Amino acid sequence: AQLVESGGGVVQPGRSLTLSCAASGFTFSSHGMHWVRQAPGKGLEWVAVIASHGNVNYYADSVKGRFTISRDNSKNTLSLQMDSLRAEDTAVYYCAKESDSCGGDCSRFAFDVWGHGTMVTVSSASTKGPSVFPLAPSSKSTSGGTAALGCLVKDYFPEPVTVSWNSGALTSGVHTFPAVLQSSGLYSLSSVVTVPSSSLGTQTYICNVNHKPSNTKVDKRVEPK
Amino acid sequence: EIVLTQSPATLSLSPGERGTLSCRASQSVGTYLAWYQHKPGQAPRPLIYDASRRATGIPARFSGSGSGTDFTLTISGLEPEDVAVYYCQHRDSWPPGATFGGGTKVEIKRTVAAPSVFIFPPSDEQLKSGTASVVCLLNNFYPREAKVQWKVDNALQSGNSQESVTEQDSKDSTYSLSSTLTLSKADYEKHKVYACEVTHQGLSSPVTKSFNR
């Protein structure tokens, strides 16, 4: 059985988004339904519940008065209307089905079917593509040792960016780091690779950066200065 | 009103090693306690229902036990795909809200590996645009604990750096870390020596990487 989740997006603070889940392979109206979320750097947080026949609901204090949970036992869908959004509402949201009774030994207090998760991002930032700067290998790089080089992908919004090296031909020793959110509200990440210092004598290194929201495509060669 | 406290914060297990995860409730919850496995980018996966009942398709190496306030999840021997964050969870009928523990990160334990350490001055290109980012890279180290401190003309920097750490490497079970120090171009030009001080248990002494602007 499945919960097929949709919705989500990127909005300004004080604005609204609606999330939805469609039931598949089970009797929707027979089960209580929940929303759960996970904010960056935090754990799972329960958000809201609506009873099987929509007659009782309940909210976490953190969202009470702002979010509205509802269900449609005709279309067999579950909704979360998220109004008055705050930056701290930024999170992956999951719909979840209450676990089944089983003739006495099983409770309805767990979550047995989960939606895949969808991202909600709340920020005053507006769409901006990144600047891409080289992280050139040290002049001290010398044969027999290991050299590091990379690209700094700075000041973009929203997530995500994708980075490859040499159009995907280079993967060994690559580390593309989780983006960090700057006080400016823009993201920044670095992508590096370590290679034999010897390889600087023969090999071209190009970082391929893509930020779809801004249609930004950059291919930057990284060489010793 | 119900709080679930998980420990340890991180549980480090060699492949094949047995491990136990603890979840303690702030008051009795009977057997109303579930466990989920969660990996970045996918839905939480039910492991254990009602304290001890395995969820559909969950391998026998996962077992739940306990009642009242003290609960445990046992992994009889870590397999690589078991690396994940594990949460316990409670709910009752009324009031109906669920409570989650804070999570226990399960990671692969391996031998100590010291980081290789690299520093990158800002590019002339970035300087052209009025900002200066200095980057410090700690490459492929274990365990995850590391300290990076920035010094500018020997002055300890505070509040102007951010760092990021990769997920555990699928090949060698190490971590990598990037720290970025950010200054205005003006501020950057007012100093000469930029240094990254790295402390890790794999290093006999902290390593300092530096350059003259």
Strand, coil or helix: A114: strand
CATH of the domain at A168: 2.60.40.10
Tell whether A119 and A202 lie within a shared domain. no
What technique was this entry resolved by? X-ray
DSSP string, B66-91: EETTEEEEEESS--GGG-EEEEEEE-
| HSE-CB for B95 with a 13 A CA cutoff | 11
A35 and A79 Cβ atoms separated by less than 8 Å: no
For the CA atoms of B49, B53, B57, B60, the dihedral, rounded to the nearest 10 degrees, stands at 130
Residue that is last in its domain, among A81, A109, A124 = A124
Q: Does B44 touch chain A (CB under 8 A)?
A: yes
CB A19 within 8 A of CB A118: yes
3-state secondary structure of A167: helix
Burial B140-175 (b: 16+ CB within 10 A, else e): bbbbbebebbbbbeeeebeeebebbbbebeeeebbb
For residues A214 and A141, membership in a common domain is answered with: yes
Residues A11 and A61 in one domain: yes
Contacts of B182 (CB under 8 A, 6+ apart): A182, B131, B132, B133, B134, B160, B161, B162
Q: Is the C-alpha dihedral spanning B78, B82, B83, B86 positive or negative?
A: negative
Structure tokens at B34: 């579930």
Per the CB < 8 A criterion, the answer to whether A122 and A209 are in contact is no
Boundary-marking domain end, from A124, A153, A169: A124
Contact B126, B180 (CB under 8 A): no
**CATH topology agreement for domains B1-110 and B111-213:** yes
Mutate to test the interface with A, among B3, B164, B167, B188 (most CBs of A within 10 A): B164
> Are A166 and A178 part of one and the same domain?
yes
Instruction: Tell me whether residues A43 and B87 touch, CB distance under 8 A.
Output: yes
Strand A118-122 and strand A9-11: the pairing is parallel
Contact between A36 and B178 using a beta-carbon 8 Å cutoff: no
Q: Does domain B111-213 have CATH number 2.60.40.10?
A: yes
- Taking the Cβ of residue B176 and every Cβ of chain A, the question of whether any pair is shorter than 8 Å is answered with yes
Q: A115 and A131: one domain?
A: no
Shared-domain flag, residues A106 and A18: yes
Two structure tokens written together for A47 = 């958000």
Q: Which of B39, B127, B11 is nearest to A134 (CA)?
A: B127
Helix ranges (DSSP H) in B1-143: 124-128
Assess whether A119 and A9 both reside in one domain: yes
A183 Ramachandran zone, left/alpha/beta (phi>0; psi -120 to 50):
alpha
Instruction: Give the number of C-alpha atoms closer than 13 A to the C-alpha of residue A165, restricted to the C-beta side.
Output: 21
Same domain (yes/no): A214, A149: yes
Task: Please report, for residues A65, A81, B52, B97, the alpha-carbon distance to residue A60 in angstroms, rounded to integers and kept in the order given.
Answer: 10, 14, 27, 7
CB atoms A109 and B32 under 8 Å: yes
Q: Which of B38, B99, B139 minimises the CB distance to A148? A: B139
Contacting B residues, span 2-21, partner chain A, CB-CB under 8 Å: none
Residues of A in contact with B100 (CB under 8 A): 43-46
Nearest to A60 among B43, B97, B135 (CB): B97
Indicate whether A118 and A132 sit together in one domain. Answer: no
With CB atoms and an 8 Å threshold, state whether A152 touches B100. Answer: no
What is the C-alpha separation between A177 and A160, in angstroms, rounded?
A: 12
Q: How far apart are the first and last CA of chain A?
A: 57
Domain boundaries, chain B: 1-110, 111-213
Mutate to test the interface with A, among B87, B116, B120 (most CBs of A within 10 A): B120
Q: Are residues A154 and A217 in the same domain?
A: yes
Among the candidates A70, A92, A124, a domain finishes at A124
Question: 78-97 in B: which are within 8 Å (CB) of A?
Answer: 85, 87, 89-93, 95-97
Distance of alpha carbon B123 from alpha carbon B89, whole angstroms = 48
Give contacts of B137 with chain A, Cβ < 8 Å: 148, 150, 190, 192
Q: Do A111 and B34 touch (CB under 8 A)?
A: yes
Structural domain tally of chain A? 2
Chain A residues in contact with B119 (beta carbon < 8 A): 138
The Cα of A12 is separated from the nearest Cα of chain B by a number of Å equal to 24
* Domain B1-110: CATH architecture, name and number where available: Sandwich (2.60)
Whole-angstrom distance, CA of residue A87 vs CA of residue A92: 13
Structural domain span for residue A213: 125-225
Q: What is the resolution of this structure in A?
A: 1.8
User: Do A99 and A61 fall within a single domain?
Assistant: yes
